[PDB]
Design a protein around this ligand. Structure first.
Ligand SMILES: Cc1cc2nc3c(=O)[nH]c(=O)nc-3n(C[C@H](O)[C@H](O)[C@H](O)COP(=O)(O)OP(=O)(O)OC[C@H]3O[C@@H](n4cnc5c(N)ncnc54)[C@H](O)[C@@H]3O)c2cc1C
Ligand SMILES: C=C(O[C@H]1[C@H](O)[C@@H](CO)O[C@H](OP(=O)(O)OP(=O)(O)OC[C@H]2O[C@@H](n3ccc(=O)[nH]c3=O)[C@H](O)[C@@H]2O)[C@@H]1NC(C)=O)C(=O)O
Length: 322
């Protein structure tokens, strides 16, 4: 049931020597995702700088699956784990946030969104206050077109810099990203390394205000101190997920260690010892009950990921529809 990371590293004898970032086998993905659940990643790699990454992409052959993660705040990992390599870029190497002129910011892809919030305040730049509430990283924001409070990532993105699976650099633009609701059209083999941001200059007392209103909303209406991946499902047109969920009677619904948050019922909470199966079963149990109650088929906003354990597959909607 999944070869160990040892065996992966042993087949890759010598082609990985000369890499400076850490190579950790069999790292649970519960150690690295906000849900605090999931199975083993065969090998975790944490490149030191863009060139450690580029070297590691030139080194690993294409048949081995690669997955890039940031803070793992949008991932539901299954209890069977993730084959191949999992890449989490280094904070020290890819977390820098600096001002370049008077309207623009450059941020490495590992930089937490909240660091880009503070950096814009320290530069008098409006429109970055929505990163103050999103606990993810800038690499996932660019990929998920992350957004809140009526602002999305797409509106502050100037140009993005990435590596492809052959380790060759790509400077891509806001148009190339192909942005939509929680979506980018950029190739999925691309690894974002940094981005150039641009906001309209503004008064700092205002930027504070918006950031304090952003944070007050989070602390008051969302369970953002819990182990969760955030908003489970997209809001259906003309209504909202949490509502259609509460209507189906699902506020507080439990599967094992997983619960639908009684505070905000589009959030799934690991109350301590939830498995990956617990969370995907709750989600698809809610999908099933909301469809039956409203005919609305909910769309996942959290990425499900990895392998089921033997005899532990889950059918979308629990097999009730297809
Ligand atoms: C309390 C809470 C509140 C949230 N609020 C919001 C919100 O308001 N708006 C919102 O949109 N989301 C929200 N989320 C979801 C989550 O924060 C975002 O989806 C975010 O984009 C994920 O960031 P991450 O660092 O956790 O990335 P991960 O979860 O690790 O990965 C998410 C995606 O980003 C990709 N990715 C990450 N880094 C790179 C990279 N360097 N190169 C290429 N691809 C990369 C991964 O491949 C994956 O597809 C919330 C989550 C929580 C737990
Ligand atoms: C968290 C995410 O994005 C969030 C984002 O934080 C906020 C923007 O502030 O609006 C969306 O949530 P949302 O539609 O539930 O808006 P919220 O502000 O969180 O709550 C909506 C309103 O209904 C109230 N509310 C919500 C849930 C509940 O169980 N009870 C309740 O009373 C809240 O008090 C609030 O007044 C995004 N969710 C989706 C599916 O689009 C994410 O993508 O992971």
């Amino acid at each position: 049931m999944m070869e160990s990371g040892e065996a992966l590293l042993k087949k890759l004898d010598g082609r990985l020597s000369g890499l400076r970032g850490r190579l950790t086998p069999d790292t649970g993905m519960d150690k690295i995702t906000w849900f605090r659940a999931g199975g083993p990643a065969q090998v975790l790699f944490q490149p030191s700088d863009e060139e450690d990454l580029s070297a590691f992409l030139k080194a690993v052959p294409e048949e081995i699956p690669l997955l890039v993660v940031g803070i793992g705040s949008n991932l539901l990992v299954r209890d069977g784990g993730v084959p191949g390599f999992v890449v989490r870029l280094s904070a020290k190497g890819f977390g820098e946030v600096e001002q370049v002129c008077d309207t623009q910011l450059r941020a490495g892809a590992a930089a937490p969104d909240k660091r880009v919030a503070a950096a814009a305040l320290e530069a008098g730049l409006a429109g970055f206050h929505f990163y103050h509430g999103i606990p993810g990283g800038i690499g996932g924001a660019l990929r998920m077109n992350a957004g809140a409070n009526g602002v999305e990532t797409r509106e502050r993105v100037v140009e993005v810099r990435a590596l492809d699976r052959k380790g060759e650099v790509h400077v891509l633009s806001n148009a190339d990203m192909g942005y939509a609701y929680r979506h980018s059209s950029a190739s999925p083999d691309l690894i974002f390394t940094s981005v150039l941001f641009e906001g309209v200059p503004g008064e700092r007392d205002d930027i504070r205000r918006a950031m304090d209103e952003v944070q007050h909303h989070r602390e008051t209406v969302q369970p953002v101190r819990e182990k969760t991946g955030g908003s489970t499902f997209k809001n259906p047109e003309g209504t909202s997920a949490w509502k259609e969920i509460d209507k189906a009677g699902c506020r507080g619904l439990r599967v094992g260690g997983a619960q639908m948050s009684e505070m905000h019922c589009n959030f799934m909470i690991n109350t301590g010892n939830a498995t990956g199966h617990d969370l995907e079963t709750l989600g698809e149990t809610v999908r099933a009950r909301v469809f039956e109650n409203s005919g609305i088929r909910l769309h996942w906003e959290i990425k499900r990921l990895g392998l089921f354990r033997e005899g532990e597959q889950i059918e979308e909607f629990l097999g009730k529809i297809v």
